[PDB]
């Protein structure tokens with residue numbers, strides 16, 4: 001098992017597409033839901049200064065796999081083949 005963390009909000013379809021991808025491939029994940037604008041911007045600013053992201057984030061979903069920042073849904077799909085090797 002690889003360790004997957006996804007940061008999301010409700011009413012974000014790209015967050016659902018990301019989760020659905022993991023689910024359709026039987027990959028478990030831990031979801032953190034941050035619905036309010038205040039909580040999300042604090043999370044963005046925190047991550048953007050944490051050293052852990054590979055670009056400055058300002059949307060959800062944000063996906064991390066084994067502690068490596070992958071990105072949003074576009075990035076997930078771009079790496080679909082490699083992630084399914086893990």
Ligand SMILES: N[C@H](CCC(=O)N[C@@H](CS)C(=O)NCC(=O)O)C(=O)O
Nearest residue numbers: 014015059060061071072073074075
């Ligand atoms: N240029 C991308 C388009 C992104 C997209 O297709 N939707 C976003 C949801 S706001 C996403 O998570 N897709 C992949 C990504 O942005 O990295 C962006 O910054 O939003």
Ligand SMILES: C[As](C)(=O)[O-]
Nearest residue numbers: 012058059060061
């Ligand atoms: C602009 As948003 C909170 O759907 O990533």
